[PDB]
Amino acid sequence: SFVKDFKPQALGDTNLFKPIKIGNNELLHRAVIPPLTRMRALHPGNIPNRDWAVEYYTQRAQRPGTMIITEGAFISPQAGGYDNAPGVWSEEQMVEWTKIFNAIHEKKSFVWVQLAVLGWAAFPDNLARDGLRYDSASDNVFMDAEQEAKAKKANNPQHSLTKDEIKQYIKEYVQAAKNSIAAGADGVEIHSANGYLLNQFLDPHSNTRTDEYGGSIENRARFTLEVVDALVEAIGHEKVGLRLSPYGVFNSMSGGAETGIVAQYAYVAGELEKRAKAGKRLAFVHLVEPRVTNPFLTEGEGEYEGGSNDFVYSIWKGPVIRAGNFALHPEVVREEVKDKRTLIGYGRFFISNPDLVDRLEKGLPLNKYDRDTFYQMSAHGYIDYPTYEEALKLGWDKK
């Protein structure tokens, strides 16, 4: 059914429907599909779903000129630890990814692979089964008690990366980016948000290191920036974006409670602008808003009111994608897109509305999502959400 008490607004008269260039891609509108893990990849081998993934992305590519950022994709086995999320390191994976990218391009849309590395959010028992470490910035602070205990039970205690291991991850990011482009992707997004490994280095709660990768703002940012630089060198700045969540608390990040958190992210943004001014500007910076500090809480919950991401705009002068509880708040989007380099990522409601862009332009009701099937090995709740027309035929305008 449609979301009951939602009062839609047509946004066609706003910059949301003005074209913009992101990297090499001429977007026809500024509604972006942010990365959304759906757990349909198949084990063994973290293979994108052979039955349904092409259709899922095809559906969500239907509005011409849409920018799609994929679900997080593991850069290597060591970077993973969820059996049903996909990777981008193997031939068997890239066969499937190639079909997905081709399908998106057939719809005249674009696709950017999010490159993911889990760190302490991984399941240590899966990693132990596969002969892999359970990795983070540090070895003396843990995501939660349960993860610490699972790690010990699996004889795979949380391990603080060595410099050589950080370098190995960087090699893997490079090769994953190369794989992504060669298979036809338009670009990649470096996931440095939501409490995964790079975020674990950025945040002083999770990073208690005393080497060059911790203990100061510049040190905590080092790994993220080394990945940025390695990928810019490998595939070009115009094919690389970066995702950050300054106020996030998901996966035990500090958020606004850490008084140094704005400075930490301001430093990253400044370093990106420095590179841009020296001739290597990233295609975009993607920010999760303080509107959603934990994306598994219902919209309106976990909102941090004590901070704004607006500071980033004083520093970074390129495109900015903002995500977090925007589908239910067209009144907020209307104001945000007055800024001419702002794009809006719509996550959960792109799960439930394959034709979300039409609905945004035209001010149509939205399909309610089913959170129970966000993660599920099923076509149901993945490829069977209807378009607006299909929903009318099902009687949802009367339900």
Next chain:
Amino acid sequence: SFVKDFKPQALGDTNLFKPIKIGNNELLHRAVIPPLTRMRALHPGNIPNRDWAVEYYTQRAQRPGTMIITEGAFISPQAGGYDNAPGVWSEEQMVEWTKIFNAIHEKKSFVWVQLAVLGWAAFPDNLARDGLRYDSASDNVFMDAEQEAKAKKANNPQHSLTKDEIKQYIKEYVQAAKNSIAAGADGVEIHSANGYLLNQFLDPHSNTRTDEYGGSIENRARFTLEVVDALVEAIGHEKVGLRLSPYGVFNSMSGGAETGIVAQYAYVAGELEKRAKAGKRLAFVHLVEPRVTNPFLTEGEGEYEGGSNDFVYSIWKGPVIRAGNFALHPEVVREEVKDKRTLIGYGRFFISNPDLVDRLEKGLPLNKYDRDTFYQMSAHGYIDYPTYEEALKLGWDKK
């Protein structure tokens, strides 16, 4: 005469006219007199003007419950270098300061001494005459060619402070703060803005040090924070504020051209909030706006549009005084004071309007200022600007 094409707005219906507590002081309104050097102190000995300074401050204290921050006052001879700016280190000075503070208090207003240290903005020949160093963070970058040359001619080349010399300045800040309170001041403001010594340490252009006082955000902030902590210990956090100008370029600071500038100031703000949360919250943070990157340029000139100070509010949670081209822009003030912890500093138009607060409340014309007498050894352009009533009697409503 009155400013010709100014369209005043009565601001009495805004928070500008709501009381607020700053430190120990119950302000009756939120129009603050920011620090304004006037160069009426007499040589030798940097003595506040024995003829006119009491009257100047009395005039500008006339609206009950006004917060006044003094002209910058040198903490020691070594901190100075302008013969006609006052100090707060000697008995002869404090005799005059005591009269000024008493007069302000008689008007039911409040007074905060700005503690000033010039660094590279000092005149090296004055310092040489008095057997003093010409000091800055570094010795290999200079304010301008003229200052570098004056220093060499005076056989007083720019000197990069040693750790012991930084410690000596800190002792002097402590004693100057003590002197200020003992003489009756309500508090002090640490000047870390406008390109003077502390700002010279904050800014990576002027600070090329490779010891613990330079070469990173935390290192560049070290001296400013050591002064904050020393004064909090000596006289209490409720008697201490800090002034910053993130986007300033006056005195050869970097401003927004430095991509790391927001992070540098975000770090300072975070460190202040950390101290506040641990029980020692400063009375206020005073920010110069990007509206005025150089206060000796006419209003509207030298405006930086590429940055906002709004980031500070995401970090520091105490009172914020904002200064810069607000007298001519009541429409901007009206929006800024909707934030309930925002005060507005009015500088140049408080020079020319002793009764500025009445004029702001009531939406009255403003006296034009005479920049030629901003710095001058004269009562003229200091204590002979009329109140609104006096101006009407002079015929200014017809002139």
